[PDB]
Amino acid sequence: GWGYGQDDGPSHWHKLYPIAQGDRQSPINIISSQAVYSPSLQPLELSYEACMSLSITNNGHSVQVDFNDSDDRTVVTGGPLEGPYRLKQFHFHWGKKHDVGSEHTVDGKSFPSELHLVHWNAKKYSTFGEAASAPDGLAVVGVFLETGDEHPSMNRLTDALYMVRFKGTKAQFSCFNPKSLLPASRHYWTYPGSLTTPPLSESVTWIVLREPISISERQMGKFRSLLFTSEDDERIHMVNNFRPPQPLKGRVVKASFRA
Numbered sequence: 001g002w003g004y005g006q007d008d009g010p011s012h013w014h015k016l017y018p019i020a021q022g023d024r025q026s027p028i029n030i031i032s033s034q035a036v037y038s039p040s041l042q043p044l045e046l047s048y049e050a051c052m053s054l055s056i057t058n059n060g061h062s063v064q065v066d067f068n069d070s071d072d073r074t075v076v077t078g079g080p081l082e083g084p085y086r087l088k089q090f091h092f093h094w095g096k097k098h099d100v101g102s103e104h105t106v107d108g109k110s111f112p113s114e115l116h117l118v119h120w121n122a123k124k125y126s127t128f129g130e131a132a133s134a135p136d137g138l139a140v141v142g143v144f145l146e147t148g149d150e151h152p153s154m155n156r157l158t159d160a161l162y163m164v165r166f167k168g169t170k171a172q173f174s175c176f177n178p179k180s181l182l183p184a185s186r187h188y189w190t191y192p193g194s195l196t197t198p199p200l201s202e203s204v205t206w207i208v209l210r211e212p213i214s215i216s217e218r219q220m221g222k223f224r225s226l227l228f229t230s231e232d233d234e235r236i237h238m239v240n241n242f243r244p245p246q247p248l249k250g251r252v253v254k255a256s257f258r259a
């Protein structure tokens with residue numbers, strides 16, 4: 001139905017999902033000087049278990065790692081959140097070159113990639129799907145990826161990509177701790193937004209970390225080697241699977257720190 005190609009890309013989604021023109025769409029360009037320092041905010045805590053990961057999957061849009069969310073062991077809490085949100089999955093958005101790839105931008109600057117850790121409000125909703133439609137249903141922590149030095153923990157993931165290079169394939173991915181992909185800082189920006197893929201529901205509290213993690217150009221290349229296509233179809237590389245910044249429309253971006 002939708003994608004990131006020339007015929008089905010982001011610029012066209014509004015024709016299928018009208019909410020794409022809504023008042024709290026994501027991602028956004030974060031103007032650091034315009035963020036409101038918010039001391040009252042609570043400390044952001046990412047309490048992740050080491051072995052809650054289930055599999056790694058190429059779903060045609062990204063490569064996604066799914067988690068066991070039957071309990072509240074792997075959750076995000078604090079910051080703008082009133083309670084814990086359980087981690088359901090994490091995935092990435094990236095470009096064909098270093099200058100593009102992230103969904104959020106900071107003062108007009110894009111990163112080559114962006115990691116999204118998707119959590120849901122299991123205290124208020126019965127299913128991830130149900131939570132994905134409600135205004136306070138999801139909390140996504142965004143982590144920017146810069147290219148430079150090799151990321152040791154990332155290797156276990158980038159080495160697994162070959163096995164899921166084609167759309168619709170999956171592999172077991174046990175004991176991968178998502179905490180290994182977080183920067184040494186927990187400072188962040190936060191604002192009320194939406195899913196960045198259809199249905200584009202405005203159900204997401206965004207928490208974009210200030211500090212990016214770094215991976216090697218070689219590792220970033222393993223992502224650019226994935227395919228949007230099936231094993232039979234003509235090979236079309238999975239790149240530029242990101243949605244561009246959307247209108248802020250008077251929303252206030254809060255910061256946990258001072259720029």
Ligand SMILES: NS(=O)(=O)c1ccc(C(=O)N2CCC(c3ccccc3)CC2)cc1
Binds near residue numbers: 116129194195197198
């Ligand atoms: N990029 S992101 O905003 O972090 C993000 C967050 C969540 C998802 C996600 O889990 N999927 C699968 C379920 C689908 C869906 C939800 C509700 C109703 C119908 C279909 C939405 C996309 C994708 C990207």
Ligand SMILES: [Zn+2]
Binds near residue numbers: 091092093116196
């Ligand atoms: Zn995403």
